[PDB]
Amino acid sequence: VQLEQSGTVLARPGSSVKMSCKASGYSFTSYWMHWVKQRPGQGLEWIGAIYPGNSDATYNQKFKGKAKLTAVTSANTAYMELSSLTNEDSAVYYCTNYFDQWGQGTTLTVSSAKTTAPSVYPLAPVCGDTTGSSVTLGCLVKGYFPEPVTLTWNSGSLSSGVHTFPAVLQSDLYTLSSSVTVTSSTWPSQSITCNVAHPASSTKVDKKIEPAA
Amino acid sequence: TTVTQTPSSMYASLGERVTITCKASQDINSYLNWFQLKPGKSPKTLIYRANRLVDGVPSRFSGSGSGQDYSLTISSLEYEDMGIYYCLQYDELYTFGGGTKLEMKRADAAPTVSIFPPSSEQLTSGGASVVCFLNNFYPKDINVKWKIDGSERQNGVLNSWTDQDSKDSTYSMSSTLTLTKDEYERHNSYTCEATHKTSTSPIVKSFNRN
Amino acid sequence: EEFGRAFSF
Amino acid sequence: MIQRTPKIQVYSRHPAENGKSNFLNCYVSGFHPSDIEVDLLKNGERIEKVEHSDLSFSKDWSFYLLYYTEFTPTEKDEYACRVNHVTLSQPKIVKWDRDM
Amino acid sequence: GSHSMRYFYTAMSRPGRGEPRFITVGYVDDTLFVRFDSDATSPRKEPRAPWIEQEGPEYWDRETQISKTNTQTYRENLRTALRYYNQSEAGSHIIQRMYGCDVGPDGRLLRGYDQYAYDGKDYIALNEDLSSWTAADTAAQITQRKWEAARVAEQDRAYLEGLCVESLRRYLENGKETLQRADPPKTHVTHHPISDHEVTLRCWALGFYPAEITLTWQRDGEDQTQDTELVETRPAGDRTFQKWAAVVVPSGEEQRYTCHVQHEGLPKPLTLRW
């Protein structure tokens, strides 16, 4: 009754990529599959539509020449390829059957960056200031690629007062930060540590936040 | 055709009635669908044909409107209804609304400003990232200004925003200032001024390079 | 009788 | 687009018996577009106060109409139907044969 | 047997001759029962059978409103078609529509139809499944895409499975003396000498309902459907039908030729040759 999309894909600027969208539960070759684009900055925007009974496709005038809609009836699948990719194509693309049921959306990242291991840096208050009650500490994951990166605190034990801000892209490489808020009686009294794991680069780092001066 | 959705964003309490309006540039008859978007989850079609409830969707949801003006109403707002809502017309072409963000109402909270200098290993790696966390506050609206030796600096800054915390319905924010070792080393005092609706004056947290 | 709802093209 | 030439038939309701009243019918079917002109003429004089049916069509989307009027047949009165369509060069005339 | 009810819509653009004309005709089996024409002194739906006069003011008000709104919605449908095909407002185009439902001896739905045509060509049709749409050109594809993105076929299926068969059954029960009676045709053979060695023998069938019928000239048993002149079945004007079939034969071979008639209102096939 529902439909399952492809996995998150990554490409180079100027190359071309191809996404899939397998539908089930209904007659695939009698309705129009619509493809929609979601960009974090803009919003929801229509890309195209395809009828797989004979593969008739309509497109958006902004996407004419950019997108190409294909369909395989034996596999109940609808594909869509994009060429000459730019950073404006890095987005989440959804396929729907006449806007009845949507898919998980395929994520597309366009970057000319290589797989790079992160750089983990501790973040302690100024001059080791534990005087004021409730102390906030941080872990900074700079310059890594691709995504995601997992970050825990004290091997996953400390979990309250912990928020990790979404990764912000600064020139092809990402930057993430996380913040823990404990009580001055806990630090430096208890050993505090942030653990960072980048599975795509196979990197495991365990850093300890200690006072200086 | 351009459809305008209002409000762009809003704060609402539990049980409240919430109405989202979508206006078209021309009579689109009944060709309008309403979609919900919760972070990460597959979009959910709530209302189709402008005023018909999808089977299984909670009855608190209702669709209305005609001609150019349509609306979606939640009679009693629940917590699992918070997300971005979109209107779609399919009379002429397929165009979407601007999107409306449904969020939690709570008491105004002042941000917790914590500023941290670069770490030692990073200074030995050539860089220097000065970080500023603006913790648990409300509303979302917040401004940040980095200050180097007393002069405002906007170059090489990074900004990351947190969604509404499911725990206390607050927001957080991170602001990084990336410099090189020698660039950082030719200056003193790094201030992180913050401006919120709770204070007329900027919360100022700074540190010396001593 | 007659379908009282018509759908524009 | 799609023009179809009409098919014309001229007849009566009941068998034509001279002296007894009857109904002259001209059935024009299988034509497209809708614009048609049909007159029933007696001895070459077009008869006024002619009734006709409502615009219906068939499975092929081609219309069909029935032009009818009251009359009394005689052995020496020429009855005919003149049908003009966008698919005909000149108005087509069809003579009424009581045996057809 | 199985019976049927259909509705036909005819919209004609006429640039310079006024606004587009809208016409509706309703049929039950082969009997027209209602009529609408936007070019009347009073645009109104009106009955055309004795058994629909029985209905009440609410019915007629409903139908007339359903047609007066239909007039303008199809006057806009023509504009949208001219838009889709990039045509001139100065041209005369036609939008046709036929929709309805059949029922069996038990009175339940068998098949429901809803077809739309533009300029005599098939435009968009509802399939037997009452859920999908069949477009014939890339301009009807816009209509089908927006029509299923709103799941309008749901409403269509609801009407066809519901009010259609309900009202149809009501009409059959109200007029069982006319719609559910089978009146056999009245047949005779008429010889017409064209020359001294050639005569036309004609089988005449008069006054029958419905229009379905078969007329064949057989020689001593063998079917000769090749030398038979046939006329398309023609309404008599009194809601019955007429049809003849002719064969040219030599003088003397008038006994070998026999006529076989086939009507639903005929308990057994009629055989004749006079």
Output the CA–CA distances (angstroms, integers) from residue E26 to A207, C1, E52, in the order listed. Answer: 83, 10, 11
> Is residue A31 a part of any domain in this protein?
yes
Contact call for residues D24 and E84 (beta carbons, < 8 A): no
Strand pairing category for E270-272 and E257-262: antiparallel
- Residue of E242, D42, D32, A5 whose CA lies nearest to B43: A5
Domain that holds residue B98: 4-104
Chain B residues with CB-CB distance to E152 below 8 A: 49
Put residue D2 in one of left, alpha, beta given phi > 0 → left and psi -120 to 50 → alpha: left
Scanning E11-50 for CB atoms below 8 A from A yields none
Q: d(Cα E3, Cα E164) in Å, to the nearest integer?
A: 12
What is the token pair recorded at E114?
């809803």
Disruptive mutation site among B94, B166, B190 for chain A (greatest number of A CBs within 10 Å): B94
Residue indicated by tokens 């109104």 = E44
Chain E residues with CB-CB distance to A58 below 8 A: 141-142, 145
At how many degrees (to 10) do helices E152-159 and E140-148 cross?
80
Residues E118 and E244 in one domain: no
In DSSP terms, D83 is beta-bridged to D38, D92
Residues A133 and A165 in one domain: yes
Q: SS3 of E170, please?
A: helix
Residues E169 and E199 in one domain: no
Compute the 3-state secondary structure of chain C and give helix, strand, coil in percent, each to the nearest 5.
0, 0, 100
Instruction: Tally the C-alpha atoms within 13 A of residue D19's C-alpha that lie toward its C-beta.
Output: 0
Point out the domain boundary residue: B61, B82, B104. B104
Residues B96 and B117 in one domain: no
Kind and range of the H or E element at E74? helix E57-85
Residue A67, Cβ density class (10 Å: 0-12 exposed, 13-18 middle, ≥19 buried): buried
Residue indicated by tokens 């070998």 = E256
Strand ranges for A52-192 from DSSP E: 56-59, 67-72, 77-82, 92-97, 106-110, 119-123, 135-144, 150-153, 163-170, 173-182
Residues E137 and E206 in one domain: no
Residues B118 and B144 in one domain: yes
Residues B83 and B135 in one domain: no
Does C8 sit within 8 Å of E76, measured CB to CB? yes
Q: d(Cα E69, Cα E64) in Å, to the nearest integer?
A: 9
**Under 8 Å CB-to-CB from A106, ≥6 apart: which residues?**
A5, A6, A7, A8, A9, A19, A21, A92, A93, A94
Contact call for residues B63 and B70 (beta carbons, < 8 A): yes
- Tally of residues, chain E: 274
CATH number for the domain spanning B54: value is 2.60.40.10
Residues A131 and A94 in one domain: no
Residues A98 and A185 in one domain: no
Residues E126 and E246 in one domain: no
* Nearest chain E Cα distance for residue C9, angstroms: 5
Residues E154 and E233 in one domain: no
How many domains, in total, are found in chain A? 2
- Residue of D33, D67, D37 whose CA lies nearest to D52: D67
In DSSP terms, A58 is beta-bridged to A49
The CA-based angle D76-D77-D82, given to 5 degrees, is 145
CA dihedral B198, B193, A132, A192 (to 10 degrees): 110
**Under 8 Å CB-to-CB from A193, ≥6 apart: which residues?**
A153, A154, A155, A206, A207, A208, A209
Q: d(Cα E47, Cα E32) in Å, to the nearest integer?
A: 9
Q: d(Cα B44, Cα B55) in Å, to the nearest integer?
A: 12
Three-state SS annotation for chain B: CCCEEECCEEEECCCCCEEEEEECCCCCCCCEEEEEECCCCCCEEEEECCCEECCCCCCCEEEEEECCEEEEEECCCCHHHCCEEEEEECCCCCEECCCEEEEECCCCECCEEEEECCCHHHHHCCEEEEEEEEEEEECCCEEEEEEECCEEECCCEEEEECCCCCCCCCEEEEEEEEEEHHHHHCCCCEEEEEEECCCCCCEEEEECCC
Instruction: Tally the C-alpha atoms within 13 A of residue A172's C-alpha that lie toward its C-beta.
Output: 10
Residues A104 and A133 in one domain: no
How many domains, in total, are found in chain D? 1
Residues E129 and E245 in one domain: no
Contact call for residues E35 and E49 (beta carbons, < 8 A): no
> Is residue A8 a part of any domain in this protein?
yes
Strand pairing category for B203-207 and B142-148: unpaired
Q: d(Cα E8, Cα A46) in Å, to the nearest integer?
A: 37
Domain that holds residue E235: 186-272
Q: d(Cα E58, Cα E41) in Å, to the nearest integer?
A: 22
Residues A130 and A73 in one domain: no
CATH number for the domain spanning E164: value is 3.30.500.10
Q: d(Cα B194, Cα B111) in Å, to the nearest integer?
A: 9
What is the token pair recorded at A3?
């439909």
Chain D residues with CB-CB distance to E245 below 8 A: none
Three-state SS annotation for E8-48: EEEEECCCCCCCCEEEEEEEECCEEEEEEECCCCCCCCEEC
Contact call for residues A142 and A167 (beta carbons, < 8 A): no
Q: Does A54 touch chain E (CB under 8 A)?
A: no
Point out the domain boundary residue: A61, A85, A110. A110
Residues B97 and B125 in one domain: no
How many domains, in total, are found in chain B? 2
Chain E residues with CB-CB distance to A27 below 8 A: 132
Instruction: With an 8 Å CB cutoff and a minimum of 3 pairs, decide whether chains A and D touch.
Output: no
Residues B37 and B116 in one domain: no
CATH number for the domain spanning A132: value is 2.60.40.10
CATH number for the domain spanning D19: value is 2.60.40.10
Instruction: Tally the C-alpha atoms within 13 A of residue E240's C-alpha that lie toward its C-beta.
Output: 18
Closest Cα in chain A to B32:
A99
* Nearest chain D Cα distance for residue E36, angstroms: 9
- Tally of residues, chain D: 100
Gaps in chain B (C to N distance exceeding 2.5 A) after: none
Residues B143 and B76 in one domain: no
- Residue of E43, E99, E112, E100 whose CA lies nearest to E72: E43
Q: d(Cα D9, Cα E230) in Å, to the nearest integer?
A: 12
Contact call for residues D30 and D4 (beta carbons, < 8 A): yes
Residues A153 and A183 in one domain: yes
> Is residue A91 a part of any domain in this protein?
yes
In DSSP terms, D12 is beta-bridged to D24
In DSSP terms, A116 is beta-bridged to A145
Contact call for residues D91 and D85 (beta carbons, < 8 A): no
First CA to last CA distance, chain B:
60
Point out the domain boundary residue: A62, A91, A110. A110
**Under 8 Å CB-to-CB from E148, ≥6 apart: which residues?**
A31, A32, A98, E132, E133
Beta carbons within 10 angstroms of residue B144's beta carbon: 20
Compute the 3-state secondary structure of chain D and give helix, strand, coil in percent, each to the nearest 5.
0, 50, 50
- Residue of E117, A1, A129, A61 whose CA lies nearest to B42: A1
In DSSP terms, E218 is beta-bridged to E223, E258
- Residue of B128, B30, B134, B162 whose CA lies nearest to B88: B30
Strand pairing category for A119-123 and E21-28: unpaired
Q: SS3 of E122, please?
A: strand
Gaps in chain E (C to N distance exceeding 2.5 A) after: none
Q: Does D66 touch chain E (CB under 8 A)?
A: yes
Q: d(Cα E134, Cα E117) in Å, to the nearest integer?
A: 12
**Under 8 Å CB-to-CB from A50, ≥6 apart: which residues?**
A32, A33, A35, A56, A57, A58, A69, A70, A71, A78
Does E145 sit within 8 Å of B48, measured CB to CB? no
E interface with B, Cβ–Cβ < 8 A, is 145-146, 149-152
Put residue E29 in one of left, alpha, beta given phi > 0 → left and psi -120 to 50 → alpha: left
**Under 8 Å CB-to-CB from A29, ≥6 apart: which residues?**
A52, A53, A73
- Residue of E89, E86, E87, E114 whose CA lies nearest to E100: E114
Chain E residues with CB-CB distance to D57 below 8 A: 8, 10, 96, 98
Strand pairing category for E3-12 and A106-110: unpaired
Backbone φ and ψ of E46, nearest 5°: -145, 140
Residue indicated by tokens 């969208």 = A21
Kind and range of the H or E element at E85? helix E57-85
Q: d(Cα E169, Cα A60) in Å, to the nearest integer?
A: 48
Strand pairing category for E234-235 and B4-6: unpaired
**Under 8 Å CB-to-CB from A202, ≥6 apart: which residues?**
none
- DSSP 8-state code for residue E169: H
Backbone φ and ψ of D66, nearest 5°: -130, 110
**Under 8 Å CB-to-CB from E256, ≥6 apart: which residues?**
E219, E220
Experimental method: X-ray
Does C1 sit within 8 Å of E69, measured CB to CB? no
Q: Which amino acid is at A98?
A: Y
How many domains, in total, are found in chain E? 2
Q: d(Cα A60, Cα E118) in Å, to the nearest integer?
A: 26
Point out the domain boundary residue: B104, B139, B154. B104
* Nearest chain E Cα distance for residue D55, angstroms: 7
Q: d(Cα A51, Cα A33) in Å, to the nearest integer?
A: 7
Q: d(Cα B103, Cα B140) in Å, to the nearest integer?
A: 10
* Nearest chain E Cα distance for residue A34, angstroms: 9
Q: SS3 of E70, please?
A: helix
Domain that holds residue A90: 3-110
- Residue of A195, A122, A124, A190 whose CA lies nearest to A156: A195
Point out the domain boundary residue: B104, B124, B151. B104
The CA-based angle E53-E57-E62, given to 5 degrees, is 105
Closest CB from C3, C6, C9 relative to E143: C9
Residues A33 and A102 in one domain: yes
Domain that holds residue D1: 1-100
Q: Which amino acid is at E250?
A: P
- DSSP 8-state code for residue A89: G
Residue indicated by tokens 């009754």 = A1
- DSSP 8-state code for residue A54: T
Residues A105 and A140 in one domain: no
Strand pairing category for B100-104 and D92-95: unpaired
* Nearest chain B Cα distance for residue A160, angstroms: 10
What is the token pair recorded at E60?
């007629």
Contacts of B among chains (3+ CB pairs under 8 A): A, E
Does E232 sit within 8 Å of D9, measured CB to CB? yes
Q: d(Cα E99, Cα E112) in Å, to the nearest integer?
A: 8
Residues E113 and E146 in one domain: yes
**Under 8 Å CB-to-CB from A163, ≥6 apart: which residues?**
A178, A179, B135, B162, B165, B172
Contact call for residues A138 and B133 (beta carbons, < 8 A): yes
- Residue of A34, A64, A69 whose CA lies nearest to A54: A69
Chain C residues with CB-CB distance to E141 below 8 A: none
> Is residue E38 a part of any domain in this protein?
yes
What is the token pair recorded at B92?
């002429």
Residues E124 and E41 in one domain: yes
In DSSP terms, D4 is beta-bridged to D32
Strand pairing category for B69-74 and A193-198: unpaired
Residue E228, Cβ density class (10 Å: 0-12 exposed, 13-18 middle, ≥19 buried): middle
Q: SS3 of E144, please?
A: helix
**Under 8 Å CB-to-CB from A77, ≥6 apart: which residues?**
A20, A21, A22, A23, A71
> Is residue A213 a part of any domain in this protein?
no
Residue indicated by tokens 């680069």 = A201
Q: d(Cα B122, Cα A142) in Å, to the nearest integer?
A: 10
Residues B128 and B46 in one domain: no
Strand ranges for chain E from DSSP E: 3-12, 21-28, 31-37, 46-47, 94-103, 109-118, 121-126, 133-135, 186-193, 199-208, 214-219, 222-223, 229-230, 234-235, 241-249, 257-262, 270-272
Does C9 sit within 8 Å of E77, measured CB to CB? yes
* Nearest chain A Cα distance for residue E148, angstroms: 6
* Nearest chain B Cα distance for residue E52, angstroms: 33
Residues A19 and A85 in one domain: yes
Residues E202 and E163 in one domain: no
Residues E36 and E13 in one domain: yes
Residues B60 and B130 in one domain: no
Q: Where are the alpha helices (DSSP H) in E108-226?
A: 140-148, 152-159, 165-174
Q: d(Cα A152, Cα A169) in Å, to the nearest integer?
A: 21
Does E149 sit within 8 Å of A30, measured CB to CB? no
> Is residue A192 a part of any domain in this protein?
yes
